Amino acid sequence: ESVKEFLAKAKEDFLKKWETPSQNTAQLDQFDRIKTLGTGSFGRVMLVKHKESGNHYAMKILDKQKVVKLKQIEHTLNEKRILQAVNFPFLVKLEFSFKDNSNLYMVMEYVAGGEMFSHLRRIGRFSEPHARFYAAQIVLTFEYLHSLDLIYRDLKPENLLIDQQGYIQVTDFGFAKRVKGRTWTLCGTPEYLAPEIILSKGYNKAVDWWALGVLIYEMAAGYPPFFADQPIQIYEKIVSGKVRFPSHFSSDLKDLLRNLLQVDLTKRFGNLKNGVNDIKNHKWFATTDWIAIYQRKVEAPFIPKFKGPGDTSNFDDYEEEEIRVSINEKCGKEFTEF
Ligand SMILES: CC[C@H](C)c1cc(C(=O)N[C@@H]2CNCCC[C@H]2OC(=O)c2ccc(C(=O)c3cc(OC)ccc3O)cc2)ccc1O
């Protein structure tokens, strides 16, 4: 349909930004750090405040020496380059980027509402209308990113942030990559890994539709379809499939999930012929108005309450360490783009 015009338009904007990336749009001295609020292999996300404007931001700080040692230079650069190039209603907007002698910095938009993980864990499990509202936003998110030949690869409650309006903001593009065809990297989180990733096949975008199948189950059930203590046991359960559904699951959920959690790649929804429309036109999505959810005209089933003032009460506690920038420049040749 007419949605192709939009996608044509999005391909034009992304590629101009993808070919000539925004490098060094700010510096560290322009911010005040307030609180460490995230943690990953090579850094932390910190709540900061822009001295001149007064606007709060998230600021991921990654240290070059740990990125190079662990060997994840390509992932780090992928993340930055996709983030400055993309533009979508359910994606966290990279506002600024820069680096220095020791670290890489990505100053993103402050999403006051926190992770989907916390809220899911608080109320146990979402209602199928509630899971649907979220899943709809992720279907449109993956339609956009897969148009742009981008694969996301880490879809899970923790990387989805609920904003003021109850709408999702997708963050953590560390494992995200631009590829036409297949990739061979062992990327993702165990419970979400598609069987072709586990069996070390060259996988494509269908991996993101398997991940959507696991997430919708986890939103409506309150636990993942494939779970165990050791990761090896979770991998045995995924390659077989055998997804036993909760009895409270409707027939429309059970069918959609059997199609997204389809172990055979060539028969999985979103990957076969019709594309994203196999999913858009499913009976579990019959009540979703795909344009009204895009325009954010649908009433959210959960407005996530907050402290009030830009950082007042606060949320989760982490050890506050120094943002250390050494006298000399570390690994600068490797990160010449930032
Ligand atoms: C201000 C708070 C609000 C809610 C806020 C938070 C984030 C956000 O992305 N926070 C995430 C919330 N999800 C779970 C992970 C923890 C945290 O992200 C990080 O702290 C973080 C993640 C990864 C890495 C990292 O080392 C990394 C690793 C890679 O390969 C393994 C590749 C790329 C990487 O960047 C560093 C920090 C974004 C915007 C926000 O307004």
Pair (310, 297) in one structural domain:
no
Alpha-helical segments (H) within the chain: 3-19, 64-70, 73-85, 116-123, 128-147, 195-198, 206-221, 231-240, 251-260, 277-280, 290-294
Please check whether residue 212 is in contact with residue 151, taking contact to mean a CB–CB distance below 8 angstroms: no
Give the resolution value in Å: 2.3
Pair (95, 181) in one structural domain:
no
Give how far Cα 259 sits from Cα of 39, 52, 273, Å.
34, 51, 14
Is 45 annotated as belonging to a binding site? yes
d(CA 34, CA 57): 10
Pair (101, 10) in one structural domain:
no
Structural domain boundaries, residue 219: 1-20+115-305
d(CA 299, CA 222): 23
Give how far Cα 294 sits from Cα of 136, 180, 196, 219, Å.
9, 26, 31, 20
Instruction: Look at the block and give the residue holding tokens 């999913």.
Output: 279
Tally of domains within the chain? 2
Please check whether residue 115 is in contact with residue 160, taking contact to mean a CB–CB distance below 8 angstroms: yes
Residues in the chain: 338
The residue nearest atom 23 of ligand 1, judged by CA position, is 40
Contacts made by residues 323-330, CB under 8 angstroms, sequence distance 24+: 323/28, 323/33, 323/46, 323/61, 323/103, 324/102, 325/28, 325/100, 325/101, 325/102, 325/103, 326/101, 326/102, 327/101, 328/101, 329/101, 330/64, 330/65, 330/101, 330/102
The residue nearest atom 41 of ligand 1, judged by CA position, is 110
Pair (121, 224) in one structural domain:
yes
Please check whether residue 261 is in contact with residue 279, taking contact to mean a CB–CB distance below 8 angstroms: no
Three-state secondary-structure class, residue 37: coil
Pair (56, 166) in one structural domain:
no
How crowded is residue 189: how many other Cβ atoms within 10 Å of its Cβ? 17
Q: What is the CATH number of the domain that holds 264?
A: 1.10.510.10
Ligand 1 contact via 39 beta carbon (within 6 Å): yes
Pair (223, 268) in one structural domain:
yes
Told to judge if 154 belongs to the known catalytic residues of this protein, a careful annotator would answer: yes
Residue 164 is given by DSSP the state T
Of the candidates 184, 139, 141, which has an alpha carbon nearest to the alpha carbon of residue 277? 139
Pair (232, 182) in one structural domain:
yes
Determined by which method?
Answer: X-ray
d(CA 203, CA 184): 7
